[PDB]
Structure formats: C-alpha cells, structure tokens
C-alpha cells in the first residue's frame, strides 16, 4: 500500500537530507526500464551514472551473485579465497596491466591511486618525503571524501568541510599548456584526469588532449592516472575512453559498471613498477570479496560477449544526431561520446532543466539535471535502436511541449 | 582442480601485494565453519573482523538478497527507491537517533562523521572556517584513506603516503586527563574514539572511560563520535559497546556486521541538530541502494531475533575463563569483551603468534595475529557452547603443542 508520497515523506523524516532526488519512487528495474510503486513504466536515461551499463538486473550477473552467495561471501583478506585470483587474472589480461588492486567504491579506488602515486614518487622518483604533489583538472569529481573534495573546484563539494588535504594542485581541464607548466615542478608525482568529465556536465576534451597528456607525463616522469570509473566499460563506445586515442595510462581506475549495479566493486590497474610500491599491510579494505569478484567477472563477460561498446557507439551517433534537431532557442548545445551524452538548456523565467526532467518523468523517461541547465542522457548499453528512437520521441514530445 | 598453492601463486602474480594473508585458501562458508579447496573444515575465529557476526551465509540474509536482486539493485540517489526509507526508519528507531546517513564501507562512514563534525563546528558551534579540529585516540583504526591514515599512529599505515590532512590531533587512548586537556581548545569540534580498539589488539579501556568521555564532550561543547563499526551489533555482548556504560554518543558509526558479510553497508547515526548541517548535494555516494538495504534489514533482524548479544556475553565469559588457564610463560594476558577477545604471546626465538596461527590452521581453527604476539579470538555470535568448547580444546592442543 505505501504510495510515492508516503515514500518521500518517510525519508525526509528518517534519512539525512544530503540529496534532493527527482520525485519518483522506483521499486523494480529490468534492462532499460524502471517501474515505480504505482506501476508506471519509465525509460532509464541515467543508468545509475553508468553503474547499470548492462541494464537493470542482468540475468547473467544475477545468476553469478545467486550462485556465489550460497557458497561464500566474505572471508576478509586475512585469508585467501578462491575467486579473487581468478578475477584478478581475468581483468589484468583484459586491460593489459600487470596487476590490479581491488576496492569497493570509486572514491576508494581514487584514494588508492593517490597513495600509489605518492609512494611511487617517494620510493622510485626520489621526491623528499611528503613534498609530493598530485595535479587535478578543474571540474573533476572522484568522490566525497576529504581528499576528493580537497581536489574539487565545486563549492557545494568542499564548502564548510574543514581544512583540506595539501599537495593537490588544480589546473584547467582540456589545457595542455597548463599541464606542461604545472609539470615543471619535479615534486609532482602524478596527474589524475577523467578522459571525459562526467559529473561536470559531460565535458568532452578536444581531440588529441589524451595523447598530449600522455606525452607530457612521460616527458617529465609523471604518472598518468585515468579515472575511467564513469567513462570506462563500453559507456563511450570503447572499452576505455582513452582507447579513442590509443593511449595507455600509467594507472586506470574502474568502478560503477564493473558490477552491473549489483555490488560495490572498484579496481586500480597498473604495472608492477607502480603497484609493488605498496607492501603487505600498508593498504587495504570488503575489498576483493568472493561475491563481488564473481559479480564483476560476470559483468565484464556480459560487456565483452554482447559487444556493448559497438552498440554504444552506433546508438550514441544516432542519439546525438537526433538531439541536435532541437531548436537553438531551446537546446544550446549537445555533446558526448557513445551512450554518455548531455544537452544544455537556455534557462529562462519560464522553464529550466529541472522542469524538463519533471515533464520527462511525466512522459515516461527518467533523467536528472546536473547544473540546472545540463541534462544527462545515458541509457543502458543494452538498449536497441527502436527503443532508443521511442525514447527520443519521448524527449522530443517533452521538449517541444514547452 | 586448482589447489591452494595454485591459488596463492596466482594472486602473487596478478594481485597487488598489499596483504600477506595466512596461507589458507577457503572456498565455502557456513555459520561458524569454513571449508578450503581441499575440503578441510575450520572453525572461523576471525569472523571477517566482525563482519559475519551472524555466521557465514545466514539463510535469512541470503534469502533477503536473493529476493531483492530479482527486483531492483541500484537506481542511484538521483531517484527514490522504496526500500531505503523503510530501512532508515527501522535502524533509527532501533538505535534511537533522529536520522541515519547510509554509506558503503566503514572508512566512508568515518569520513562522513568527520565532515558532519566540521560542518557542525562551523555552522553551529561558530568556529572560524577551516580552523576546526578533530581529536583521535592513539592506536585508532578507521580505514585506509588519506584522512584515516592521517589520524593514525601506526607507521605502516601512514609512512610514505604523502602530506597529511591537517586538523587531526592525537591523544592517548584510555586517558581522560589528556582528553580534558585537548578539549580546552574551542576550535575542537569532535572527539572520535572506539569503545574498544579492535585493530590495535582488542585494547579495552578502564571502566568509566566512556562515561568520562561523554561528560567531557558535553561539558566543552564537543561532539562524541563512537566508532562502533567493529564493536557494535552484539559483538561485545550489547547492541553497542557504549551500552555497557549507558552512554549516548553524539554520532554512532556502524558497519561490517550491518550486512552479515553479504554487502558493503555502513551507517552514520545522529540527531537532526548534527545531521541537517549537510544540505542536499553536499555529500553522498552505491550508498543507500535497495539491495544493501534489504540485506541490512535482514541482518539487524537476525541480530535481534536470535538474541546474539546475550550469547556473545555468556560464551565470551566462558572463553576468557578458559583462555586464562594457559601458562603465564606462554600467554601473558587475555583480554576482551563478549565474543571479541585477544591473547598476547611471549614471543621468543622458538615461536611467535604467526606460528601459533599456522598450527591452529593445521588443527582446524583459523585466526590471524595483529602484531606478531597478539592473536584475536572472535568466532561468529551464532556459535554454541559445545562448539565453543571444542574450539577451545583445539586452542589448548595447539598452544600446549609447543
């Protein structure tokens, strides 16, 4: 019996107010579709921020989880389990890196990358201890820990949250001269960057930016950290976004879609020269538990077998072609890669991105704005062309209904 | 066909070397027992560091997970799901706090507590922005992020990991005069402490320490943060360890056993005056997903229905009584509360805690040392008295076999 209004009003009373979600209360999910408590059906054009790239409740990942939960779920890393090594070999051979370090959430993988970069700068590069610096790009988002917000240029992320982690420098995104200037400091150990800035509004850098970042990092003995937690795993049309420029980062961060939305699994991929700077007992975490490892194996196998990167590329081309037919007085820009796209809205005194998302919900499509004018479009990579065009028709109806 | 040696040697080749586990390779777990790939049976006296308080693969939690995975697993907090509010109401009424903030891992709950303390110190206490301090106790452990290791006094935790988070002060554990001296600084916003220091070697403070901490925090307008991620949820004989002194902390951190080892779920419990200092969009995370919420509901219901705190208390009394019968030349001290205990070993040139744990494994009992002389004993709270006494016989055999 509990309605949607009963749901909202419940959380407001017993849950922290750290979110303001779109007023819709889902209770079922399958493939590209979501169902609320009233039984209404919606296209999911958010994909839990690329966490359910494989669709909601993919039968293969569900079967993996059900098969593993009956056997063993957590031993802690004080002992070995039989699934972790299998998963590690699979993912290291899949992405062609020597080793992987498993964690749970994306921010944990980012913290691990920072600790790896600092430890490598001290023990390998020879930086005097605790002078090591890490460079980030403005608009970056990699979590909500104190360090993560310390690297942030978004006031809502860091304002009011105490003194901040030192050693984090910030340069403009999509700016090779600025990176070249920042890397003149020999105390810099790494540069962490998103190949596409997701949370900033799907900000796509210019062609050649990733190649330039790799060249500049190699030239000045600086580690290239690619945060592919949102852009990786077929979301942009390739296994990794950096594959669009044939670039091999020093450290690769994976997460989100790594489990298909069934378990918090994240990964830090790199070679021995970097990975083995952390010694036994010096870092760790549910990290590497057998259940999440089975789930992640199944998710990667689903990504590979169903060729979801090619589908993402094709249907994203179609989606961006269709979205640019909207009026210039209505949609000022359409951007993105693969099935990770965004439109920006000319906000007026008559409408805004929040009202557009409300009306989209009213018409059977779920999306959310990220800055009151930028609306994300990222359906699960299992969507077909007819379903894509029906949801595009929904978007057209909603946007031309104003 | 893959043996234990094949398992170890696999991880060594493809996994990061951030751990040195006890050489045993488990592939099945049920209740209090674990089974390795060779089919050998072991008592689990580590309980995944209190994560499987309810035993390995408890049928109720497994059924909750299987029922929820067929419906919905992750929508992200951009939308509402129907399970989160139910779980929030349940846990807030269970622990008698206004609100809960859900996260995934214990270190994330600690980060959330720090951000809450700082935001409350600025917006409520009136500390000038970014002068707020948080006090920790030496020997503390609450994760492996940069902030967590910044508060650590363990060199293996922080050595080589870059400059550290400012605003973290450290005082001795179990020291009320030191806390009283540290809280003279009006810029202190909070004191975070474990009611029993688990990772430090099950360090139990003197009686009255928690009451004194509460009195000193209330007196100087300082938030009392109780990290019960390991000591909570019936592990020490009560719902919370602080319940042994009828103390109500300002913020309570839960995790680990919150899911019975089936999902990374953590919680930050506090009242509105503290919780509502974080506004929508200013903090978040897989946090609050429906699958983990169903799992956590089932885990808390299992803890309450089976009266596991009383069993923990009784069997811990029995276990500590039996352990103190060991020779003084062999075991220099036995300490702990409920089913969270530890013995300390007179390390010589003939044996050590690692060899004792190896021989325990050889005799069918799995444990791990934490400092080369301190061995933890913490079986799942579902253990019975006959099983407890058989495992005590195993411990006696192993310890007297030297």
Curated annotation (Swiss-Prot), chains A, B:
GO biological process: arginine catabolic process to glutamate; arginine catabolic process to proline via ornithine; L-proline biosynthetic process; visual perception
Effect the entry attributes to changing residue 380 to L: In HOGA; loss of protein stability; loss of ornithine aminotransferase activity
Modified residues (N6-(pyridoxal phosphate)lysine): 256
Cofactor: pyridoxal 5'-phosphate
Pathway note: Amino-acid biosynthesis; L-proline biosynthesis; L-glutamate 5-semialdehyde from L-ornithine: step 1/1
Known EC number: 2.6.1.13
CDD domains named in the record: OAT_like
Consequence the record notes for mutating residue 53 to K: In HOGA; no effect on protein abundance
PROSITE patterns: AA_TRANSFER_CLASS_3
Reaction equations catalysed: L-ornithine + 2-oxoglutarate = L-glutamate 5-semialdehyde + L-glutamate
First-listed, main subcellular location of the protein, grouped into a coarse class: mitochondrion
Subcellular localization, as worded in the UniProt entry: Mitochondrion matrix
Disease as annotated in the protein's UniProt record: Hyperornithinemia with gyrate atrophy of choroid and retina: A disorder clinically characterized by a triad of progressive chorioretinal degeneration, early cataract formation, and type II muscle fiber atrophy. Characteristic chorioretinal atrophy with progressive constriction of the visual fields leads to blindness at the latest during the sixth decade of life. Patients generally have normal intelligence.
The protein's assembly and partners: Homohexamer.
Record family assignment: Belongs to the class-III pyridoxal-phosphate-dependent aminotransferase family.
Protein name: Ornithine aminotransferase, mitochondrial
């Amino acid at each position: 019996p509990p309605t949607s209004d009963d749901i909202f009003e419940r959380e407001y009373k017993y849950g922290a107010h750290n979110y303001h979600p779109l007023p819709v209360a889902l209770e079922r999910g399958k493939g590209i579709y979501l169902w609320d408590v009233e039984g209404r059906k919606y296209f999911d054009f958010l994909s839990s921020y690329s966490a359910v790239n494989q669709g909601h409740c993919h039968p293969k990942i569900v079967n993996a989880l059900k098969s593993q939960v009956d056997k063993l779920t957590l031993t802690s890393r004080a002992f070995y389990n039989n699934v972790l090594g299998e998963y590690e070999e699979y993912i290291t051979k899949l992405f062609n890196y020597h080793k992987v370090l498993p964690m749970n959430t994306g921010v944990e993988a980012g913290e691990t990358a920072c600790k790896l970069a600092r430890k490598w700068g001290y023990t390998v590069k020879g930086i005097q201890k605790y002078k090591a610096k890490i460079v980030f790009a403005a608009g970056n988002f990699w979590g909500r820990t104190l360090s993560a917000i310390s690297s942030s240029t978004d006031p809502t992320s860091y304002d009011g949250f105490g003194p901040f982690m030192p050693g984090f420098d910030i340069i403009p995104y999509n700016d090779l001269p600025a990176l070249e200037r920042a890397l003149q400091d020999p105390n810099v150990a790494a540069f962490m960057v998103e190949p596409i800035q997701g949370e900033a509004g799907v900000v796509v850098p210019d062609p050649g930016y990733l190649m330039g970042v790799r060249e500049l990092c190699t030239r000045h003995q600086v580690l290239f950290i690619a945060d592919e937690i949102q852009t990786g795993l077929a979301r942009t049309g390739r296994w990794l976004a950096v594959d669009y420029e044939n670039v091999r980062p020093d450290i690769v961060l994976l997460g989100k879609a790594l489990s298909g939305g069934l378990y918090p699994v994240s990964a830090v991929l790199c070679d021995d020269d970097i990975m083995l700077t952390i010694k036994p007992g010096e870092h760790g975490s549910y990290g590497g538990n057998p259940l999440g490892c089975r789930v992640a194996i199944a998710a990667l196998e689903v990504l590979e077998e169903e060729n979801l990167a090619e589908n993402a590329d094709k249907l994203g081309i179609i989606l961006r072609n269709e979205l640019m037919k909207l009026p210039s007085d209505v949609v000022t820009a359409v951007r993105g890669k693969g099935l990770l796209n965004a439109i920006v809205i000319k906000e007026t005194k008559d409408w805004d991105a929040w009202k557009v998302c409300l009306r989209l919900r009213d018409n059977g499509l779920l999306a959310k704005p990220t800055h009151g004018d930028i609306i994300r479009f990222a359906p699960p990579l299992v969507i077909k062309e007819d379903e894509l065009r029906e949801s595009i028709e929904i978007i057209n109806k909603t946007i031309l209904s104003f």
